[PDB]
Amino acid sequence: ECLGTIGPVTPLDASDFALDIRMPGVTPKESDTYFCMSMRLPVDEEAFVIDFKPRASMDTVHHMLLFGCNMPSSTGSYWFCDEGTCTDKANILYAWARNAPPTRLPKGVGFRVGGETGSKYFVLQVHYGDISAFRDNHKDCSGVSVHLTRVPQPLIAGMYLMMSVDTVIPPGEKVVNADISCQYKMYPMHVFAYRVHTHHLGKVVSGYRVRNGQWTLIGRQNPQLPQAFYPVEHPVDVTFGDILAARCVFTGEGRTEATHIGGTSSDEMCNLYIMYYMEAKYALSFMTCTKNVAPDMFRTIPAEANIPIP
Ligand SMILES: [Cu+2]
Ligand SMILES: [Cu+2]
Ligand code: NI
User: Are residues 13 and 151 in the same domain?
Assistant: First the structure.
């Protein structure tokens, strides 16, 4: 699968091209190795990401994530993602998970990149699980083919990130809730996909839109299942005056010391990635909620938010 003499850029037609984002023939020496690499966009003008095709080794790649950003964490050929993904904010565009197949972008929908305000780089994370296939000492070029176009898209994809920052999980503690909430104050977004992220202590993650005190399910997932972007059961609009609300349920069981929010496996995260589309003339590409503005509101959270997925 390694790119040879033809390189990473395929002409599709007048205004479209495929960009292949692949590891430069890497060979992991340990299990659960996270490798990152970057690619500058080959065009300066604004472009739209309208499709993704995975190029994974079905024998060694556990997951892949693709981000857009302006400042990749390294200037090197490739690095361990422990160093970081991007030094500015990494905008997730795509997740590929083993045993949980991705869902296509709706037609007419694209991420805006490049230009004056869009991402100038793609960063690709590859999670290598079982490295028993690397007994060959073979070079791996797993990654993702992205379909770019110059043609403006009627609908712009973006990300609403809900994330905990203050969470403290005391050791042995049966149940710890991490609650996130913000008022929505932009033009309408329609949620079409969601991804959940915790580390090993996470039991369930749920996101809701609350309007006039009524809770509407965006997504609810066990974070110990493959962390792909999952389609929303039914399209959900989030509109001015709505509150977005999310809860991660953790346990402290099995830990001798307290667990707080951080980047390592002995730390936790409570992340819910809400992938939306917006009308192009109304669109903004990213929003983040790191707060809990209506904590008392969580008294009426559906009971399913506290119950593990069977
Ligand atoms: Cu993985
Ligand atoms: Cu994490
Ligand atoms: Ni609608």
Answer: yes
